[PDB]
Amino acid sequence: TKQVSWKLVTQYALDTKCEDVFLLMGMYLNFQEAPAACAACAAADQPNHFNHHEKHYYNAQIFADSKNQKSICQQAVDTVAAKQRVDSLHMTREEMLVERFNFLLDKMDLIFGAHGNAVLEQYMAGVAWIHCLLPQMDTVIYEFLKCIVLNIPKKRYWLFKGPIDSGKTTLAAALLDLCGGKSLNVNMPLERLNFELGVGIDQFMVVFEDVKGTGAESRDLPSGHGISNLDCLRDYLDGSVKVNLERRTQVFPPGIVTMNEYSVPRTLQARFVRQIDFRPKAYLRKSLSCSEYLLEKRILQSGMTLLLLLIWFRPVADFAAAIHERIVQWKERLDLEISMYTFSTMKANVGMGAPILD
Amino acid sequence: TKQVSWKLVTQYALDTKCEDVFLLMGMYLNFQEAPAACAACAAADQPNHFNHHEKHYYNAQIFADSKNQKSICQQAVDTVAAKQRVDSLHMTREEMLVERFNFLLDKMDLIFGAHGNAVLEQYMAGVAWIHCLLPQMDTVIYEFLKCIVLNIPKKRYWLFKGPIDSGKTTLAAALLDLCGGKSLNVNMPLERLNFELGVGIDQFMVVFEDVKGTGAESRDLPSGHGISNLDCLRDYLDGSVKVNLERRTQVFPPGIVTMNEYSVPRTLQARFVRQIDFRPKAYLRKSLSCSEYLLEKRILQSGMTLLLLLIWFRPVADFAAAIHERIVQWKERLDLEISMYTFSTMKANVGMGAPILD
Amino acid sequence: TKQVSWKLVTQYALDTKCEDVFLLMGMYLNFQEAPAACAACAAADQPNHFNHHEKHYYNAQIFADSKNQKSICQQAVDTVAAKQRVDSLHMTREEMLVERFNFLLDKMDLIFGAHGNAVLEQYMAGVAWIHCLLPQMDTVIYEFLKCIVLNIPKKRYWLFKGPIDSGKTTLAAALLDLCGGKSLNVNMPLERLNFELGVGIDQFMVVFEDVKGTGAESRDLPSGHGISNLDCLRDYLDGSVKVNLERRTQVFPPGIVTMNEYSVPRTLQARFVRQIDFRPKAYLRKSLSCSEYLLEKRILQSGMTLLLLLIWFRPVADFAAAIHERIVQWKERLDLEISMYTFSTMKANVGMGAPILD
Amino acid sequence: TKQVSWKLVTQYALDTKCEDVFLLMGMYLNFQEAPAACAACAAADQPNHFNHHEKHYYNAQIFADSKNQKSICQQAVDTVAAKQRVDSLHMTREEMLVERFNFLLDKMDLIFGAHGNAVLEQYMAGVAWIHCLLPQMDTVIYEFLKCIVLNIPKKRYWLFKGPIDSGKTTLAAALLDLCGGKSLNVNMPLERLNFELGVGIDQFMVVFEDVKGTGAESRDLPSGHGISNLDCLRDYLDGSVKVNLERRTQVFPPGIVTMNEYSVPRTLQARFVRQIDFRPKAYLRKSLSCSEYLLEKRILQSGMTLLLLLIWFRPVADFAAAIHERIVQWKERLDLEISMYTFSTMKANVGMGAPILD
Amino acid sequence: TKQVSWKLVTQYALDTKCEDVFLLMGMYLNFQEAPAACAACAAADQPNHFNHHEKHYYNAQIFADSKNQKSICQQAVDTVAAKQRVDSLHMTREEMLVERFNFLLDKMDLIFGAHGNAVLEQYMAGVAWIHCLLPQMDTVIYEFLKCIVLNIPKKRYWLFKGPIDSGKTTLAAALLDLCGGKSLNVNMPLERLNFELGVGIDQFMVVFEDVKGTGAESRDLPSGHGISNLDCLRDYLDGSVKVNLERRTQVFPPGIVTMNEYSVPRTLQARFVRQIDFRPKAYLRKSLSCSEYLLEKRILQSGMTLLLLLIWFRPVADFAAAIHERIVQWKERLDLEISMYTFSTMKANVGMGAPILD
Ligand SMILES: [Zn+2]
Ligand SMILES: [Zn+2]
Ligand SMILES: [Zn+2]
Ligand SMILES: [Zn+2]
Ligand SMILES: [Zn+2]
Secondary structure (H helix, E strand, O other): OOOOOHHHHHHHHHHHHHOOOHHHHHHHHOOOHHHHHHHHHHHHHOOHHHHHHHHHHHHHHHHOOOOOHHHHHHHHHHHHHHHHHHHHHOOOOOHHHHHHHHHHHHHHHHOOOOOOOOOOHHHHHHHHHHHHHOOOOHHHHHHHHHHHHHHOOOOEEEEEEEEEOOOOOHHHHHHHHHOEEEEEEEOOHHHHHHHHHHHHHOOEEEEEEEEEEOOOHHOOOOOOHHHHHHHOHHHHHHHOOEOOOOOEEEEOOEEEEEEEOOOOOOHHHHOOOEEEOOOOOOOHHHHHHOOOOHOOOOOOOHHHHHHHHHHHHOOHOOOOHHHHHEEEEEEHHHHHHHHHHHHHHHHHHHHHHHOOOO | OOOOOOOHHHHHHHOOOOHHHHHHHHHOOOOOOHHHHHHHHHHHHOOOHHHHHHHHHHHHHHHHHOOHHHHHHHHHHHHOOOHHHHHHHHHHHHHHHHHHHHHHHHHHHEEEHOOOOHHHHHHHHHHHHHHHHHHHHHHHHHHHHHHHHHHOOOOEEEEEEEOOOOOOOHHHHHHHHHHOEEEEEOOOOHHHHHHHHHHHOOOEEEEEEEEEOOOHHHOOOOOOHHHHHHOHHHHHHOOOOEEEOOOOOOOOOEEEEEEEOOOOOHHHHOOOEEEEOOOOHHHHHHHHHOHHHHHOOOOOOOOHHHHHHHHHHHHHHHHHHHHHHHHHHHHHHHHHHHHHHHHHHHHHHHHHHOOOOO | OOOOOOHHHHHHHHOOOOOHHHHHHHHHHOOOOOOHHHHHHHOOOHHHHHOOOOHHHHHHHHHHOOOOHHHHHHHHHHHHHHHHHHHHHHHHHHHHHHHHHOOOOOOHHOOOOOOOOHHHHHHHHHHHHHHOOOOOOOHHHHHHHHHHHOOOOOOEEEEEEEEOOOOHHHHHHHHHHOOOOEOOOOOOOHHHHHHHHHOOOOOOOOEEEEOOEEEHHHHHOOOOOHHHHHHHOHHHHHOOOOEEEOOEEOOOEEEEEEEOOOOOHHHHHHHOOEEEEEOOOHHHHHHHHHHHHHOOOOOOOOOHHHHHHHHOOOOOOHOOHHHHHHHHHHHHHHHHOOHHHHHHHHHHHHHOOOOOHH | OOOOOOOHHHHHHHHOOOHHHHHHHHHOOOOOOOOHHEEEHHHHOHHHHHHHHHHHHHHEEEEHHHOOOHHHHHHHHHHHHHHHHHHHHHOOOOHHHHHHHHHHHHHHHHHOOOOOOOOOOOOOOOHHHHHHOOOOOHHHHHHHHHHHHOOOOOOOEEEEOOOOOOHHHHHHHHHHHHOOOEEEEOOOHHHHHHHHHHHHHOOOEEEEEEEEEOOOOOHHOOOOOHHHHHHHHHHHHHOOEEEEOOEEEEOOOOEEEOOOOOOHHHHHOOOOOOOEEEOOOOOHHHHHHHOOHHHHOOOOOOHHHHHHHHHOOHHHHHHHHHHHHHHHHHHHHHHOOOOOOHHHHHHHHHHHHOOOOO | OOOOOHHHHHHHHHOOOOOOOHHHHHHHHOOOOHHHHHHHHHHOOOOOHHHHHHHHHHHHHHHHHHOOOOHHHHHHHHHHHHHHHHHHHOOOOHHHHHHHHHHHHHHHHOOOOOOOOOOOHHHHHHHHHHHHHHHOOOHHHHHHHHHHHOOOOOOOOEEEEEEOOHHHHHHHHHHHHHHHHHEOOOOOOOHHHHOOOOOOOOEEEEEEEEOOOOOOOHHHHOOOOHHHHHHHHHHHHOOOOOOEEEOOOOOOEEEEEEEOHHHHOHHHOOOOOOEEOOOOHHHHHHHOOOOOOHOOOOOOOOOHHHHHHHHHHHOHHHHOOOHHHHHHHHHHHHHOOOOHHHHHHHHHHHHHOOOOOO
């Protein structure tokens, strides 16, 4: 009988960075029907399907007849995790960021292309809103990227502080999506903490989202174990040494801590190289209300919006040499749809609390 | 010796959406006797049997001789879960709803057909009672379906509030059955919470049923951790970002929260785009008492009752194009059994607290 | 079909001391392309790749076609752990230290060589700062190494005591990296303690880092279970007998305990042969501020910095005979870059709180 | 292809009493190179290597080519545990002690032989110090051995009571090493107790080391659950019946309980056939300070020191017939190095707090 | 190659009632050397060896060459447990007792035979002491056996109450050994209780040994959860219905509850068909002190002592027909060693607190 090439299944998982055994199994089985009459290839809207169907057709037919499908996929997903282990030790942090940027640019080429449904002007309206959230926003994003790539001990964490609806959660989520990584919850007791801290294994950055303090009930701020927990994770935050994570011995990822207006102990404050305070701006909330596509299409939380922001404001030299050709094609695309004049009109509209797109 | 086709067992599980290894094993073994003398095929009351017996007979005989039955079924059930993973990422939410609607219509074709035991007039009496529970009920159901399909961040949860016997539990259960999904219990301590929150993996919607508050003992309302737990799951409820679920990284499903008349903190209230208050109506309870078939046949909790409601009130254009032919056949079926005149008589009977069917 | 040599995969894991199944898998797969056109071999910056690619090429190609990759790697990683078991019982502690010294010297030959990116003068500036942290620092480091190698019962633990930014954490981390071993956290309750104490299995030394006491809130020192836990581990600290560790029956490793200025009970104090008090020195902090490369390149926490310190101050006879040839080549390398005169200038610069490198 | 003899691997584990799968794997792989050029055989310092290398060479070469090494070793280690099960039920307790005595004498032949590094006069100085710890010490050791071999119900436990540095921990550790067995910690809560009590499975004796009481803080004695726990283990201590141990249904091993000067409840006191009180003796501490080799080489905690003590004081008839030939050779060895005159000088030196060896 | 007969290994486990995989493995390997030169067969002191060596020699040699020894033994031990399942449902309780009696008589034939070391007169002295513990002791033992065999609901538990050294623990242990079964500890909290209650699966009887109450500290009686736990296990004690045990759905075994002089709640008291109060008798303690062999050889806790008691007092008709031939041979053996006259002298000696044997 015919033998399935485990190596070809592995190659597909590697090309698509597949970390889910069931997702790989499902995607591979979907290559078993003739590409000539494939409606999915014809629609050309899922690159992980249409760019691989022809190369994997004959092997996928054999795979459909296999009595050992889960094992084939488990080896393929293990090889992807093995590659991630190698890269976490050999790749420079700049190459890691280039890899994430190429991933976001692939999505961008799809959603804003001939077979996509995203509206580029809507994302650019998102860029304008984000550029109004803080002064020198392109520099704030750029200085954050440099802090994450350089990963300097004791100078690797930023504190985002402010009430709800201040944009702190949105910007931290957008930054996490731009760099790739995980959001953690440290509001649990120390007993459960180590398995949550384990979520940081081989991650480029982390966000300790919505960390809570105590005795702030008189200000209507909920109680939690977060601030105390963080105050006891100086080694995780400092990144001076490798920590023993459980779920690897590695430097805990750098990142962001977001929190409401709680009292920050002197010891925990010393852990942050920077603190950005987010305050409610009526015009930002009003403009967002008038530009519902931003909320509906989850634009403000997107790393593609921050990459678009960076491509709009920064020259080709501000990007690593390996992505120069993609930045050039994207700058040409943005010039066709918006000008510095119309971009400035969008920002004036945000400032007035008016719809961003006229 | 003869070899069992694992692929054919998988196809049967896929066609029947089988997620239970033991159920698949039992159903497949029941195909091993000759279809010509099969009493189950003759009775024609179980489509998952009678539509597959002929196609699976020879393979089922070989399967009966297999020394590896559980493994064959485990691969088949894994392929179904693999397909669900693919669909959760590639299918649009409208296609997901069409899939659930075709599932309910299959059941409807069976129970109200030549080999069924359900009484269509009884279900239509259920439609009349449900249409009396709230004003513009067909619009309330339709606006809910649009909120679940659109899945807009921060505008994805409805709050059903009221005492017991007010119809809040019944309507939330009927809506969950119409969309497909799971009911969750968050009245447990936060330590056990994450495995309950895990029940939401690849689910189209969820219901946090009968969430409890504190200090309402003076109103005879029981104490529980539910309201506090929900107030700490802003990220799960908002659906602005993907959450790390344990039992996948995904947007937590949208849905409903049902609760008795507890105090709702300002922070948790902000999480709900809509709040429907359910109050006891003597006529509704009296009419239900006089129409016992509704309780006995579990009609008021059924998604088939809400689909029948939708088919009765809404034109073919209000349904996705893919189910237009099935809606037409069902509208013709309903016209034969009830008219707008007799439907209005049923509602007047509900309003009087009289039996719905004269 | 061709058969993968499990023995050759094992040999690669043994030569590289590979303890991670996924890392081994990834590294071995990276040998599958022709060495003649290998960019990684051409770059010559990863010895675990370039020194093994030619020897493992044909086997790695066969390994890429294997349906049992994880099993091959699990046996290889088990053989490495088996070797560690044999060595923990048969190797003398001096041979164990020589093994760690040869590991650090391999890294040093790489980072300061033709294909490395480290700056030797920066590390020597680190040596000068460390030599200013305590009087007779080369003797303090040397007397520590003798205490760890001799492993004398009740005379095997040193206590590092002082406030934050006093250099106690940095020096303990640098000593742990020079000897090889693990840092432990005993601030948890006794229930979780035994699995943490298990981290010490086959380890040459341990550091109980940042151990906390109670009732020091009035001095802004956080509360924890550490000091009490240690006071109940007399058998672990004394090393008079073998302890039953869970994760082996062995003598618990010797080491260091670091802590802030808490009260030390008379019983726990008796456990330490030496106590070094670390006090803040403004000039040390100022000099470090002016010499940012030390913080950025994690030089002060490095065992390579302490080995460089030892090679600078101590003659060839102070090192075991087995590494005499490597010490000689390193003394010649250091003489080319620094003199006793310029080294003394660096220390005077530290003393002034000025940049270490002029 | 050549087949590895699993039976020969098992025989090696049986001859060496190997209970560790990884240690067996490592030791067996070390037999794969030619014995003719083996440096380890030439050094003749590890009998578990040099007495087996020639017999296992060809099989070890085949073992190096095996794809199932861990399984081969797991069966070998299971056979050793199987043998221990058989012996625990069929061997008399005298034969069990002879087995332990032959194990200690094997170590003694090695460390004090041509390829050993131990100094016999140092161990004999240890014998002199131990003989000064209590009156009639050779009789105390001999009466203990008889209590452990006879294993009489309710007359099987001795209580060692005294402050720290009184020699109670040292003597209990030395007795445990002379008989073979495990030290247990019962200071934990009853919930974790049963898995600790499980450490006693197939053990010849146990030591409940440093058991703590309550309300002794006013005497600077730490609090713990030990004394209370023991007071509830009358069945374990009495050994009248078999207990259900978890980690077997067996009589819990006899042994020793060591503790500081806590109050012992009347019920727990009744459990001990003997109580030896250890008080600080300045001369013993002073002599030990002047004879540092005892501490450095862990002589006072060694069962070889107590066996040497027994061989020095007791005639050949006091030992089981099966070890008479080994006792004779050891008495001849001791006569060459010490006389009753010089032994008495050593004891006088201990009594003066002077170095034991002049 | 030669094949090991798994069926023959199973037969050996069945003949010896082997429930331990490791013990079976060890015993089977000990059949591999020639029976002609077997010292163990020559000694004739272990029937599980000498009665099976010849029948299992050739198979044991093949077993020594097996690469799957643990699996062979696991199937054999599973077959023994399978047989126990069948017997627990099909055997009458009288047949179960006959099976236990034949097991004790096998041990008796060995220890009191030509190759045994037990002294029958010592056991008969034990019989005399036990016959002095309560009036009509042969009837008390006989009425207990009838209560356990009949297993009548609500009339299946006896309560043994008294201080320590009153003989309650000894007699309950002797009765448990005569019937076969397990001793349980219910002094733990209800959370751990169900796994302890699970120890009763397929057991003929159980003893809840040394059950504790509360608020008896003023009488120097320790506190525990036992009495409260038992008061909540009415269904387990009553045996009216099957209980769901976890570690089977079965009637919980009948048995005994032993306890010190605590207050017994009215509800728990109702659970016991009989209560025997044990009070200290100075003469019994004095006689035991003068007859140390009873304590040393664990005679008073032995089911063989109670069987000997029964054989001495009761005629052949009081025993089941299936063991009549063995009772006759044992009555002839006892008549040779003791008479009714000398037995009465032994009891008079117990009554005087004198040595039992003159
Ligand atoms: Zn396609
Ligand atoms: Zn059929
Ligand atoms: Zn290469
Ligand atoms: Zn050798
Ligand atoms: Zn034999």
